[PDB]
Symmetry: D2
Subunit: 344 residues, 4 copies
């Protein structure tokens, strides 16, 4: 099977497996795991922030950030197709008692004027707007890179109102590799950033939240409440340090493989826009096929290629360390064989 | 002052004042207030439902309905400009732990195909869609009437998936008067309807939720939790019986006054669409004026007319029993004088 | 029927009925109801506070106070048998996301040393203690009066830790009449007090929260969220002004009737402690009877007397304006006849 | 340092470190991690249950169980000193919207008659009792073993009412070793059991929830919402399998070391009851010392022994794999040297 479903399926490198076996550990509830502590120090340093917090998932990273930024009855502005709204189980309503205010963007970029219009006036009928969340890269639109200028303008709006800014940077190193913007420059326009270790950077488990000391203290207590306060989690942090410090540069290979995949899919005749492919994701539309996305996914699966439908007419293909150029070429031979069987 | 801010400002009639003074009362927590019990009986009968529940506000009516229809973490589909999302203080997230799924409609009518697309499939990442809310009339769009066929098709969609349907019928009698659809007919396509007594029907306080016996018992316990469990509330229900049984027919006068207001505002030169005015509300746009909506609201207030801005470029004018045709004519004179000094 | 179930069953006086009929009203959402505004002014003045808030029930009064005093995850210290824990539908957990810390008291008075021990230290495992609630009079223990020195010492403890203090003063005027302590004096040791109009003071609907300006504005927004934001509620406030200004002194009659009831029940042979009866409630124990409290309640109801069991072995009898000494004498005759057939 | 603070401080065995490095992993969000899957199969088999769910902490295990057993506004009966109430950050109120009903027990055993009395009647004022939680062993009382007969009688009560039963079995294998009761026999009297891998069984991270298939499916979705849905968590489950299958028998050594510690502390002159010591915990009281528990903890820390104060007059000592008999003897020499310096 060639697995193009997600970059979460990456398996740990040999260096990571060794580091996990040899990890120096302690009880993180007492702040005594030295490898967790070093991962958090490195993460804060990398992002230009005072403090950092390891969490067992990107979902938890986002939700403790929302909890630490908000009070009950607040409203959170976020992009209408972003992960926090789409695919985090409604946690923001249950855990934090906040409402989402979905703003449809273009490729993850909310028009700053629409962000302005979404902020609630001080009026007894309205929730209090206390948080704006930005996702970079933006998953649903195809791993698109949100321009730094968009983040800067939204930060400017937030400072005018006293509103917190959170970046869902699950794939912020993919954004950085594609744009040349260092992650600490994105992070300078936010109060908090969540970034994942367990996607393209190939750690088996985890993400990190970075921000100011007082915010991270609140987020750490939120983590305890949600159940993310682990014991000898240095076993995980050992792999996370390798992910953060050694696995960023090679994300360029995933980007090259996704672009090559898209170029050749277009040549075959599929509805793909290679010009849209800036990081490790390709959106393929079924408009010129007689099957819908779900039927094409099943046909691919039966032919040895795993992918996911993100709508009835769109499939998402995701590259990562565990699909090589050889694997991409094999997948393309499978896509080529299938095209005459599914074309309209 | 000529008050076009809202139809909530209606004061009780002399008949209502007499009825409140001599209301037969009892302790509603024990179900022993005879006037509450008769109002609920009349309301259930009027709407063709098994049971009904008096509440002190339309907000509480919507929120106990949401609580009784949902579990924590569920999603509620509703129109993106509907009152439950716009102007109920984020209560659905705080009180029920549910997420709104805002669907932008056309004049309050969500496209049924967009409703279909908004229902979550059963994946672990997604909330469970358990409720669809429809607002009729639709406030923000200008008191617009949602077509019965829209409500009917959404009811069919909901039945398929085992999803509940709630009508926010704050102004459902205005809708009925304008469409000719009996309120019982609207209500047959919903599990619950909230309708207000304290707006155009001129009661001083309250709304009523109608629905099935088991739903209403759940909503009654939700009412107790939220603090709507009153004692000798028959004082209020006495005016409510008069509102429900005697004040519906004259809503036609409010509609005629709103249509007259809109026609004459257009003749003066203001940006109004009299063809959009089907019940008791008029939207005026400030696009051809030197001031925005907030500037115009202040100019109007200084000149003796009260209205509200619903955006930076739109004001909402609402007619009701306590603005006569005389008052509308006087307001139009004020609008005419103001036009030369606000015109662009 | 002779109704000893509760003092909530009080019906409005003729003076109240006239006042409701001619109440001067306005839209309370705009702060424009003159009778609500005067009731809140009188209430704040009576209790020595900056501001006040009318609410439709004592439950809502307590719950908006909790919301305005707390953040999600906080803990609220309160007496283990107090109404907020016992009989407010778990609202503090649902609406505010706070945990109760029940402290068993003696006659409603929590030992201040137990309050000290219940305050959480700052550890990551513990909620933040942000509120202490005191109930005076204390309902479940038999309408008992919490000593002023208890309230004073708990106030000192709370001030030390920056913890808010709420008095559930549903029956604070009963406490004041029995103790000689002015309600303003009780209230000076609390941040907020909720007191009821709809119990012994005989208004048909409502309670009032008093406190600081900023707290009351937070509580007013909480009221909007919960659905207590009414329109022309001056109809209710007119009766409330009469309740607050004219119905306090005669609570002495309720106390005398309760004490007479208890003395005569003991003379008959029932298990009652007349020395415990300081306001308008009597606890009767069924330990020397063939029936339990529920069996005795049914026997009483069949004989024309309404009361409530508060446990399997205890019934609560409550006096109020609508049970005269004549009615108490008639109830005692019924109790005497029943004794020979229920006695053990 | 001799660390008697907790059994959470256990470090992974050499066999665990090897197994983590060699773990066969996959993406647990897709159910594709074979080592997680095998751990869950083994756990369900061991406890006689249909299904099992790995979680990153015991706190998360308890809280997803509460979420899966309850609806908003429910009440949970639990022992007044149990971990869910004492030390889980008020999560049950925030995450599930439920109230605790603390019942003071004797050594973790709630009197079944008190459990009966705590169940709420069906009444509009009351939350719905839907869950009873039992903790075995009971931490705060000194690692005490709850008798099987207590669990059986509480199960009997729950079946009469349709109430769910959850065992907080963080240390259920310690209970089993001490009592001879197999864990699947305890579990047969519960709907769910949470047990920890990361305490005495020496895994670095994690716990497991066991129960019926439908309950575990709900708990798995709760885990996704809280942020416990990890990716290649087979690295952790590899150690967890060794913990579950190889580390249970040697808990007897921890019990022998705790009993030896207690016997010799009593001989030295400290206020310890060796007869109370049935598993791996010892409570030492400071009643006969001139210092309180906090001062004694600091004196111990400065002398090379780590422990924790659980009140102002009580310290808890906890044995585990990483304190040997040699370490216990060294700690006792330190306790002996200190006694003349702190005795009253
Ligand atoms: C932008 C963003 N933010 C947060 C998370 C939550 O991170 P998690 O809780 O899964 O560790 C994710 C997870 N995406 C998983 C996925 C699956 C298939 C294809 C692509 N992506 C995310 O894309
Ligand atoms: C559709 C709808 N649903 C619920 C409510 C809540 O009802 P309340 O809690 O206020 O009783 C309202 C209230 N509209 C008040 C208003 C003010 C100004 C202009 C127009 N309308 C509503 O329009
Ligand atoms: C101390 C206290 N606080 C708040 C409330 C809530 O107030 P409500 O939401 O009902 O307006 C009550 C209500 N007691 C009603 C009752 C019934 C039978 C016998 C005695 N009392 C209360 O005693
Ligand atoms: C009975 C019980 N249940 C759940 C948990 C939560 O498990 P956690 O979320 O920490 O993995 C714990 C944790 N006790 C940690 C501790 C520290 C010091 C001394 C003794 N114990 C527990 O004792
Ligand atoms: Ca900032
Ligand atoms: Ca991975
Ligand atoms: Ca239906
Ligand atoms: Ca009105
Ligand atoms: Ca104060
Ligand atoms: Ca009354
Ligand atoms: Ca069962
Ligand atoms: Ca451990």
């Amino acid at each position: 099977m060639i697995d193009l479903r997600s970059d979460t399926v990456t398996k740990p490198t040999e260096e990571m497996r060794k580091a996990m076996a040899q990890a120096e550990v302690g009880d993180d509830v007492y702040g005594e795991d030295p490898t967790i502590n070093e991962l958090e120090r490195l993460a804060a340093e990398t992002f230009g922030k005072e403090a950092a917090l390891f969490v067992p998932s990107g979902t938890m990273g986002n939700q403790v950030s929302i909890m630490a930024h908000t009070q009950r009855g607040d409203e959170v502005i976020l992009e209408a197709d972003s992960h926090i709204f789409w695919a985090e189980v409604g946690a923001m309503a249950v855990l934090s008692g906040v409402m989402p205010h979905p703003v449809p963007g273009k490729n993850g970029a909310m028009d700053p004027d629409d962000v302005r219009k979404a902020i609630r006036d001080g009026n007894i009928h309205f929730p209090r707007t206390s948080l704006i969340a930005i996702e970079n890269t933006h998953n649903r639109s195809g791993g698109r890179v949100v321009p730094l200028e968009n983040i800067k303008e939204i930060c400017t709006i937030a400072k005018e109102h006293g509103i917190n800014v959170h970046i869902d940077g699950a794939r912020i190193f993919n954004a950085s590799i594609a744009s040349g913007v260092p992650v600490k420059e994105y992070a300078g326009y936010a109060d908090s950033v969540m970034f994942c270790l367990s996607k393209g950077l190939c750690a088996p488990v985890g993400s990190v939240v970075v921000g100011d000391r007082d915010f991270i203290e609140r987020a750490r207590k939120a983590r305890k409440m949600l159940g993310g306060g682990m014991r000898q989690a240095g076993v995980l942090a050992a792999a996370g340090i390798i992910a953060l410090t050694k696995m960023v540069d090679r994300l360029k290979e995933d980007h090259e493989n996704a672009r090559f995949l898209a170029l050749k899919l277009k040549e075959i005749g599929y509805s793909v826009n290679p010009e849209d492919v800036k990081t490790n994701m390709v959106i393929l539309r079924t408009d010129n096929l007689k099957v819908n996305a779900h039927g094409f996914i099943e046909a691919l699966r039966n032919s040895g290629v795993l992918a996911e439908a993100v709508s009835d007419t769109e499939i998402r293909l995701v590259t990562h360390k565990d699909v090589s150029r050889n694997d991409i070429e094999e997948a393309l031979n499978i896509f080529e064989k299938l095209f005459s069987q599914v074309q309209h």
